[PDB]
Amino acid sequence: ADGVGNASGNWHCDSQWMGNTVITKTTRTWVLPSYNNHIYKAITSGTSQDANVQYAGYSTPWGYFDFNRFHCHFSPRDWQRLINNHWGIRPKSLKFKIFNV
Amino acid sequence: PNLGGFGLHNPPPQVFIKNTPVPADPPVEYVHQKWNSYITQYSTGQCTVEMVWELRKENSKRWNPEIQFTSNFSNRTSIMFAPNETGGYVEDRLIGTRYLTQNL
């Protein structure tokens, strides 16, 4: 696909307002460690006897991306253009990239 | 213009309107005089003004929110920019156009 000395993507942050739609683009730099040191761990609440706080599950070596807050996608100024001029908003489509690894 | 607005070499034309004089009863025997006798007239109607305005869209990369004109009048005995209890229209606040910002 690409070598050592070529960038595999470009930086994109903008908001586009066209008609009844707005398109937000945002780019971040991310850091991923190696979690658990490449193993799965069975995790619980331990010796806790309180039923309310008990849990059982697994931690994984994997990480993940969470963009699920609005201020990820909107500058404060864009949020202003949204809320002053419009009666409604809903999400339509989503595109996600990882590059320059 | 010093008062503000748009200076125009060719401003919108003046629209003039009069009630056509309706003369009163003339004398049966002709007399040579200026005619001062009229029936009292007045007129009323409706007029529509339709103006087209060209706009420049705000285009700005500013990150933080800007200043907006808003209603901060709070609690009132009548709505601001509306009629009052006796029907008088009330605009007590001057409103300019300069809220959005731009670099020099």
- The residue behind tokens 């003046």 is B14
What experimental approach yielded this model? cryo-EM
Rounded to a whole number of angstroms, the CA Rg of chain A reads: 20
To one decimal place, what's the resolution in Å? Answer: 2.4
Helix (H) or strand (E) holding A83: helix A76-85
Question: Is B64's CB within 8 Å of A76's CB?
Answer: yes
Using CA atoms, how far apart are residues A41 and B74, in angstroms rounded to an integer? 58
Distance (Å, rounded) from C-alpha B55 to C-alpha B57?
6
Contacts of B64 in chain A (CB under 8 A): 76-77
Residue of B58, B61, B67, B102 to mutate when probing chain A, most A C-beta within 10 A? B61
Say whether A43 sits in a helix, a strand or coil: strand
Query: Could you give the CA distance from residue A98 to residue A9 in angstroms, rounded to a whole number?
Result: 8
**Residue A77 CB neighbour total at 10 angstroms:** 16
**In this complex, is the C-beta atom of A19 within 8 Å of any C-beta atom belonging to chain B?**
no
Angstroms from A23 CA to nearest CA on chain B: 15
Q: Give A13's contacts in chain B (Cβ within 8 Å).
A: none
